[PDB]
Design a protein around this ligand. Structure first.
Ligand SMILES: *Cc1cc2c(cc1C)nc1c(=O)[nH]c(=O)nc-1n2C[C@H](O)[C@H](O)[C@H](O)COP(=O)(O)OP(=O)(O)OC[C@H]1O[C@@H](n2cnc3c(N)ncnc32)[C@H](O)[C@@H]1O
Ligand SMILES: *Cc1cc2c(cc1C)nc1c(=O)[nH]c(=O)nc-1n2C[C@H](O)[C@H](O)[C@H](O)COP(=O)(O)OP(=O)(O)OC[C@H]1O[C@@H](n2cnc3c(N)ncnc32)[C@H](O)[C@@H]1O
Lengths: 573, 573, 52, 104
């Protein structure tokens, strides 16, 4: 028996923990995954000295914890086997494939992470706000009040995440990219640093935020928090919330301890589901919400008919560029350079403070030093330069989010021929209209690795605006990136596999009225009809959005916590 | 000030810790890497429920922590860049490449792991003993006494690692492979389970051993060990041991705290270096042993002239097979099978206890159940069958180690078309003669990511026996594997990149006499001339060996601990 | 290249490889329909795919 | 050095080349369709023994070239198809189409 039980220890579960543990509730938190991030429970895995000295290795860590949601049956022909090798006569269901999955109506890139801290153990930490055009309403029929509510929530969310916009201000490459782009757009698009949940500790080390930043996940009471009560239970699969007959209250949570194998039930006053966009839906359908099985337009679910419909996932386009001669030369534009590198007469000098200098003395010092101390190196960019972190945020005229960076990347053998300082990643993210026909449903026959109903997507990018914009977005990235340099072979402009982006929303969406807004939760994130069940995460987001959604999810979760605080009393200590 | 300081928290450092903490010494242990394995410090990363349900994901975890030792300068031509992209006129030293490294005399596959627990956080756990022909002498001129010493040490080492040979005894696939191979070799090669450091917890879960199994790495004194004294200090780069003038004692250890950035010196009575085969050597050369820079046959080192010479690394060949029709049919040889799968009249039955049955009732029950409950599946192998774990150990007539398994593997899109139950991995490991010209040396100019002298290999597989055997080994794998099935396209028989196997030895090798045996340490693992400096690890192994070396390294470390116990007194508590 | 230039495949089965990295504006069928000269009678697992 | 080893295939009645009654080729002729698997038994046993022989023999000359490792080629890439209109002494007894004068 607890006051509040939270399912999932991602950053959204940790938001509930942070708020409700702090308010004096007796909180339990369950995660199907385990503690595997260091002694700072749920912390960012890229926060080791060794990763930040070998950053491209971190892509392997990400890949290592993204388990595909729905893999269709493979029908590739291998006919170069030896005649003595066994072979089936059909492409039968194998290797964990989902036989319900139509391969042409999938989000093949969709994956989930089951570790304490969830995906915040490996995420990129971009935390932009949504402008009005992307953001759900919290107040109807008063845009000023709606804006005020959002500003207060986002401000608190940025606090929890430790979001900043200045941590890369001394990167030459950041500047080189940003300063060029902003000159070329006539004042009509603004470029800034990507808002990042991160705190720089030194010129070569950044403490990336995670779930741990939000709530440290240590059991309470403890010496630092003698009057707070929190337990975390890893390796516990949460299987079912038990509805009363009237569908007005949750009465218990069924759990399966993965280590001992025993199954228990846990009683709480308040149940919060923060298991991710896919797994919140799955846990609800396994508890009798919506329906199991292929959905039928004839026979709609009587409980939460909108659950698992109107799903949205963003279109994502990607390339890399190799920095232009014009930009590399500009790095050293203030220098007088005489002689040949490595010879007795070679020198690189600038005049401090000169008004005709393009760059401040701090830049020129770094470049001159690099050029004189490494005469074997033909580039003016210092070696430990921080990576670019550049965006122009979504606007009506360019309704896509943008990120221009140099993230961990496993370069092929030939790409590795190009100096990393020259390389810039482009990721542009489109918004997807919610459509009732776009669904996440669950098999009534087939189960996943945890014996839970197997997730199946029925998804296509909507015709109309969504598809028109996606292609206009690809074009925008081709045009914009050309200002910085040409494409890197092997990383040419491309659409990524649907749902590789992992910004799925709308699976259990928010609105004012269940029927009118075709939704599942209200603006307190409370499940319609239920006094004591709340959902948190990107699945609540009901709108077409391009920007990264976690900050917005967190903001909604703070609002939900406020409701819980106003309506449920902590048990006495 | 401590009694003993250990550099490295791998399984060999943990062996010293286990022995010496237990004996009542005040022990400190430093590791350059961090705690990033769960709350069981230094434990196997594959021991999560989630990895053992998604085993092929674990290859990414391995790749994520193998940082290449020496990468040559890349000279691949990329001439499909845009004309506006900047490009150098030469293939200049870039992207962390080592300009000292001749690309044709490298171990390009050599990598290191810097995390608490070292490589034992991700290793395969194969712990065979070396037979005489592979094993260094501990007693000269008495083979019986030498055998007795080795048996006692290995027995203790197997205890520490929890080595077993029975954990896969109920795998159909294990049996299928082993039972066929042993029939085909006329009694002249023996097949057994690979000895594995592992404890099965259930039919689908194995607790793989690690450094944590050896020593739990918790600070002491603690409630469980009130009279023991141990501290572990992660993120501390150990930079230099300080020699006295006579080269007879170590006087301190210089350390660099990676978090605060401060440098300290630590005093101990006894210094043990267990930083791996590469990094033991590096720490010694940075402390004035051997020499820095390209070695000169004219000017040999006056201190430990054999350090970094006679290095050995194994040749490794690999393929996968797809199981033969004959073997798949044999799985079901005892069954009467009538009708067509999925139709009303289909049945699969056997007669329990029948003498003409090839398989015991436990096998036949599993197969019949699988075949009747999954009629959509055309294979007789049950779905959660444990993986094969088969070897024929090194012998004079086949002087290579063998492992026939189904390990984590990132299958290409087309390979993923083949049912995983059909797939068997073959890894054959050759022995390499120690040759003085095979060297690991360190640059006097170039440094690595930790500002330490950059490692450089001068390595070729010796001509003669080593190369003749390697090719005979490839042939043996082609011949042997054909008995089980044909090769899997995309995993055809191949040599792996030199040193990808990570079984480097001989970098600081053991022998009886420094001059006579061309070596660095004695049979107590004590550095010649020094009263109080010990080295542990595969770098001590001076012989040509094919089998996996960690168990043998551990056995030598137990012997070294015995010497320390006989000669240094613990400080009073 | 001359050899490859004059070996025309006898029987090519219907291709069922998934390409899901197309732009959303690109047309795509809902099925792997008979296309590009493939032989719809051909079982891909009982072929001489190399015959030309 | 290239290694090509070529195995022999038992004639089996179930291995067929047939022609569509509906589908035509580029020359408006009935579309060829194969129903082929390498026979079980001797044919498959020998093919795999043949692969092994090439691994053993070639090792005497040198190691494998990466990118050209030992492999089976796609069925019929070899272009040595026979038996489609086969010869024998007696149509019925020898299950054949032409006599030893190649006369139908
Ligand atoms: C993968 C990653 C994601 C990421 C990104 C880059 C990559 C490589 N970069 C992002 C960024 O720059 N900005 C942004 O806003 N988002 C970014 N993301 C996505 C982000 O990580 C997610 O949006 C965020 O983590 C979602 O948080 P939430 O707390 O909603 O969900 P979670 O992190 O997935 O954790 C949910 C957890 O619950 C567990 N679980 C799942 N099922 C169960 C059951 N049945 N029972 C108990 N627990 C359950 C998980 O194990 C998990 O930890
Ligand atoms: C990578 C791996 C290795 C492995 C294998 C499979 C793979 C994928 N499978 C094996 C198996 O089946 N059987 C076997 O016997 N070996 C297998 N291996 C290799 C095995 O993991 C190693 O032989 C073993 O771990 C060696 O142990 P040792 O304790 O000697 O060394 P370590 O594990 O490398 O850890 C050394 C540590 O010290 C640190 N370090 C390095 N430099 C410093 C400095 N300057 N200062 C302080 N600490 C230092 C590391 O960070 C590390 O943890």
């Amino acid at each position: 028996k607890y006051d509040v039980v939270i399912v999932g220890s991602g950053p959204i579960g940790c938001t509930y923990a942070r708020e409700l543990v702090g308010a004096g509730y007796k909180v339990a938190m369950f995660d199907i995954g385990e503690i595997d991030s260091g002694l700072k429970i749920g912390a960012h895995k890229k926060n080791t000295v060794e990763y930040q000295k070998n950053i491209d290795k971190f892509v392997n860590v990400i890949q290592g914890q993204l388990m595909s949601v729905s893999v269709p049956v493979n029908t590739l022909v291998v006919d170069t086997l030896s005649p003595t090798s066994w072979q089936a006569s059909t492409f039968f269901v194998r290797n964990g494939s989902n036989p319900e999955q139509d391969p042409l109506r999938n989000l093949s890139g969709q994956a989930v992470t089951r570790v304490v801290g969830g995906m915040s153990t490996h995420w990129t930490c971009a935390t932009p706000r949504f402008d009005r055009e992307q953001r759900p309403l919290l107040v109807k029929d008063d845009a000023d009040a709606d804006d005020a509510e959002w500003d207060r929530l986002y401000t608190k969310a940025e606090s929890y995440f430790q979001t900043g916009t200045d941590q890369f201000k001394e990167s030459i490459r950041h500047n080189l990219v940003l300063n060029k782009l902003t000159e070329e757009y006539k004042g009509q698009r603004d470029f800034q640093q990507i808002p990042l949940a991160a705190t720089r500790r030194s010129p070569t080390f950044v403490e990336w935020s995670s779930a741990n930043t939000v709530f440290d996940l240590q059991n309470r009471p403890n010496t630092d928090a003698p009057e707070e009560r929190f337990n975390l239970f890893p390796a516990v699969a949460c299987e079912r919330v038990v509805r009363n007959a009237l569908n007005s209250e949750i009465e218990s949570l069924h759990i399966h301890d993965l280590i001992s194998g025993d199954r228990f039930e846990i009683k709480a006053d308040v149940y919060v589901l923060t298991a991710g966009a896919v797994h919140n839906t799955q846990l609800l359908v396994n508890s009798g919400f919506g329906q199991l099985g292929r959905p039928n337009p004839a026979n709609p679910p009587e409980l939460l008919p909108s659950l698992g419909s109107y799903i949205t996932e963003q279109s994502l386009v990607f390339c890399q560029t190799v920095m232009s001669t014009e930009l590399i030369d500009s790095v050293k534009s203030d220098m007088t350079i005489r002689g040949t590198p490595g010879e007795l007469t070679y020198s690189v000098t600038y005049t401090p403070g000169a008004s005709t200098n393009k760059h401040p003395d701090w830049w020129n010092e770094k470049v001159k030093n690099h050029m004189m101390q490494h005469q074997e190196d033909p580039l003016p960019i210092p070696f430990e330069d921080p990576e670019p972190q550049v965006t122009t945020l979504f606007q009506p005229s360019h309704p896509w989010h943008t990120q221009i960076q140099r993230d961990a990347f496993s370069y092929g053998a030939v790409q590795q021929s190009i100096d990393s300082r020259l390389i810039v990643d482009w990721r542009f993210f489109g918004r997807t209209e919610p459509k009732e026909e776009n669904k996440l449903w669950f098999s009534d026959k087939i189960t996943d690795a945890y014996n839970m109903p197997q997730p199946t997507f029925d998804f296509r990018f909507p015709a109309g605006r969504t598809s028109k914009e996606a292609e206009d977005m690809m074009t925008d990235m081709c045009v914009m990136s050309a200002k910085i340099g040409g494409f890197l072979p092997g990383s040419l402009p491309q659409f990524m596999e649907p749902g590789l982006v992992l910004h799925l929303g709308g699976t259990h969406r928010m609105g004012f009225d269940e029927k009118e807004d075709n939704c599942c939760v209200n603006t307190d994130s409370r499940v319609f009809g239920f006094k004591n069940l709340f959902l948190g995460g990107c699945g609540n987001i009901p709108t077409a959005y391009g920007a990264n959604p976690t900050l917005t999810a967190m903001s909604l979760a703070i609002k939900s916590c406020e409701y819980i605080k106003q309506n449920f009393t902590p048990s006495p200590f």
